Write a protein that binds this ligand. Structure first.
Ligand SMILES: Nc1nc2c(ncn2[C@@H]2O[C@H](COP(=O)(O)OP(=O)(O)OP(=O)(O)O)[C@@H](O)[C@H]2O)c(=O)[nH]1
Ligand SMILES: Nc1nc2c(ncn2[C@@H]2O[C@H](COP(=O)(O)OP(=O)(O)OP(=O)(O)O)[C@@H](O)[C@H]2O)c(=O)[nH]1
Ligand SMILES: Nc1nc2c(ncn2[C@@H]2O[C@H](COP(=O)(O)OP(=O)(O)OP(=O)(O)O)[C@@H](O)[C@H]2O)c(=O)[nH]1
Ligand SMILES: [Mg+2]
Ligand SMILES: [Mg+2]
Ligand SMILES: [Mg+2]
Length: 562
């Protein structure tokens, strides 16, 4: 059972693709080593195709079946509703790919007659035909990275596979409520997307503290989407059907499963037949929920096979971290080998073998880790951080070029307490918004795969709400964290922190002079930058922010706008 079969046709671009970071005075002011920053393009798709194409051998055992029974039992408690066409239309992002049937995202969002007509016809066809494969488009993702020579140079483009806009709206109708509710019901505290960054830290720290001698590891499945089998996808359908659903939803979900999720033909942007998929599509509404469920089932069963004691797992799509009670160094190492062997039997071998870790800060989940800093009183404060290389590289690109959805604002929100987000990202972007007179302009950004419209001037109350008041006064960061930041700045040609402090003092002064929300930004975000610090009291407007639904479910690949 090959994940893909290919015809030899190329994955083709739909527009001009830039490979190299453009030179721009403002981007260069953030980082000068522009030759290290690149975007993936369709040019490397062949290399990706090779990597993602393989045979899946899958052997399920008693542990697998025991866990599946638990999951189905949990699912039976869920009630999920159909969304109306109108409701689903409104979840469509302004930048979603247009339909081949004569309408686009804007038409969907304004409920235009042509769009709604077609959507209704697609729905009727899902109800009447449960068999005919639905077409999909395959594209190469254009995503920005920094080169890492020691690690093979440049990453090939990821491939995304997605159906027509009409179909995407129907997926929302049938499954939006299901994918928004089911993971949590099934795996409880193990579902990672229910947590804001601070809540994720709280979960990991308590798990770590709860063990007599904790041991943790991350498990990296090689090409997770390709490892997902037809039977895995049909099992996901069986799980969805355990919920209390509307009768039409049951039919639609079965049709979507057999016609779209389980596999189908791949067409490139030029209309050429590229091949056929028999694994997870990366650009459907169920990508995140499906990957999370399937990862959880296999991992939980594999923990049992591995004889791991008192396991706590955190699962976000294909990203898995496990914290358990150590049985000793040799014992733990052997258990991880057994865990890997089990995961391999279930179709999910690792890229690189997992390694047992015995320090909390060294455990990396969704490219992030827990670290410790201190508040003004010397109290330890735990917070979520990560290596700043990718965030800075993308921030540079987004300064040089207008992008539909900007990673930098999401990164500031997620990583607000970090030394690097505070001193570099905040200083940089407020200076940019000041230069361009864009302080008042709302921006699109992503949080767990869903697109939000956020006003940069609302950052302080947002940060207080998610991270607490201490986010604006952390100091005495860890040696490992300081060193990681320092190494990154050297690599990328980013000015040193003391230079950013000077720049921040100027940014702060300009914001203060504007009064209102701008002044609150200057006061709270940049208190670290002045000699005589202000007293920061709770921000009034904080409680009035509607953060409903932020950090509650994963929607990567799902074409969701909130
Ligand atoms: N994690 C989790 N497990 C659950 C949940 N609900 C039920 N289970 C477990 O799932 C297992 C299978 O469920 P059932 O087959 O319905 O349990 P049963 O009806 O008593 O039948 P047996 O378990 O086979 O004896 C049970 O052992 C439960 O402990 C849940 O909400 N979350
Ligand atoms: N499964 C999946 N993950 C994606 C996709 N796009 C971005 N990602 C992210 O990529 C991560 C997986 O990266 P890796 O474990 O490094 O594997 P990889 O994507 O093949 O990249 P390499 O390490 O170069 O092999 C996931 O955890 C996601 O956070 C996607 O379309 N599907
Ligand atoms: N289509 C699709 N996109 C995904 C999936 N998982 C993650 N993504 C998106 O891929 C983009 C890049 O993923 P990131 O979370 O930044 O991970 P990354 O590109 O490997 O970069 P690092 O985490 O820093 O290593 C983000 O916008 C994610 O929302 C997926 O399963 N399908
Ligand atoms: Mg992986
Ligand atoms: Mg230790
Ligand atoms: Mg990554």
């Amino acid at each position: 059972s090959m994940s893909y079969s290919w015809t030899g046709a190329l994955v083709t671009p739909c527009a001009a693709e830039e490979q190299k970071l453009p030179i721009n005075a403002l981007s260069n002011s953030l980082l000068r080593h522009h030759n290290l920053v690149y975007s993936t393009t369709s040019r490397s798709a062949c290399q990706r195709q090779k990597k993602v194409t393989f045979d899946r051998l899958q052997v399920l055992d008693s542990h697998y079946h025991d866990v599946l029974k638990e999951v189905k039992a949990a699912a039976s408690k869920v009630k999920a509703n159909l969304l109306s066409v109108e409701e689903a239309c409104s979840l469509t992002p302004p930048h979603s790919a247009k339909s081949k049937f004569g309408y686009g995202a804007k038409d969907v969002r304004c409920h235009a007659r042509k769009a709604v007509a077609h959507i209704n016809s697609v729905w009727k066809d899902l109800l009447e035909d449960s068999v005919t494969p639905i077409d999909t488009t395959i594209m190469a993702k254009n995503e920005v990275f920094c080169v890492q020579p020691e690690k093979g140079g440049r990453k090939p483009a990821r491939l995304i596979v997605f159906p027509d806009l009409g179909v995407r709206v129907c997926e929302k109708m049938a499954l939006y409520d299901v994918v928004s509710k089911l993971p949590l019901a099934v795996m409880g505290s193990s579902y990672g997307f229910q947590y804001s960054p601070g809540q994720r830290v709280e979960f990991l720290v308590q798990a770590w503290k709860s063990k007599k001698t904790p041991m943790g590891f991350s498990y990296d499945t090689r090409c997770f989407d390709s490892t997902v089998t037809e039977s895995d996808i049909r099992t996901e359908e069986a799980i969805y059907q355990c919920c209390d659903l509307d009768p039409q939803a049951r039919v639609a979900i079965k049709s979507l499963t057999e016609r779209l999720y389980v596999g189908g033909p791949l067409t490139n942007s030029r209309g050429e037949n590229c091949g056929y998929r028999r694994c997870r599509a990366s650009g459907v509404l169920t990508t995140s929920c499906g990957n999370t469920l399937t990862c959880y089932i296999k991992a939980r069963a594999a923990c049992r096979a591995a004889g791991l004691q008192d396991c706590t797992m955190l699962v976000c799509g294909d990203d898995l971290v496990v914290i358990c009670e150590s049985a000793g160094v040799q014992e733990d190492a052997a258990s991880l080998r057994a865990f890997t062997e089990a995961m391999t039997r279930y179709s999910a071998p690792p890229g690189d073998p997992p390694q047992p870790e015995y320090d909390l800060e060294l455990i990396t989940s969704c490219s992030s880790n827990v670290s410790v800093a201190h508040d003004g009183a010397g109290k330890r404060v735990y917070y979520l951080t990560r290596d700043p290389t990718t965030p800075l590289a993308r921030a540079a690109w987004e300064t040089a070029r207008h992008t539909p959805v900007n990673s930098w604002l999401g990164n500031i929100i997620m990583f607000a307490p970090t030394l690097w987000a505070r001193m570099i990202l905040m200083t940089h972007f407020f200076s940019v918004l000041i230069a361009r007179d864009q302080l008042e302009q709302a921006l699109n950004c992503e949080i767990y795969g869903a697109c939000y419209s956020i006003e940069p001037l609302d950052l302080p109350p947002i940060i207080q709400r998610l991270h607490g008041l201490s986010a604006f006064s952390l100091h005495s960061y860890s040696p490992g964290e300081i060193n990681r930041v320092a190494a990154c700045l050297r690599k990328l040609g980013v000015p040193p922190l003391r230079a950013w402090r000077h720049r921040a003092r100027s940014v702060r002064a300009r914001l203060l002079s504007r009064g209102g929300r701008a002044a609150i930004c200057g006061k709270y975000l940049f208190n670290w930058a002045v000699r005589t610090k202000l007293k920061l009291t709770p921000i009034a407007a904080a409680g009035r922010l509607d953060l409903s639904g932020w950090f509650t479910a994963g929607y990567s690949g799902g074409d969701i706008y909130h």
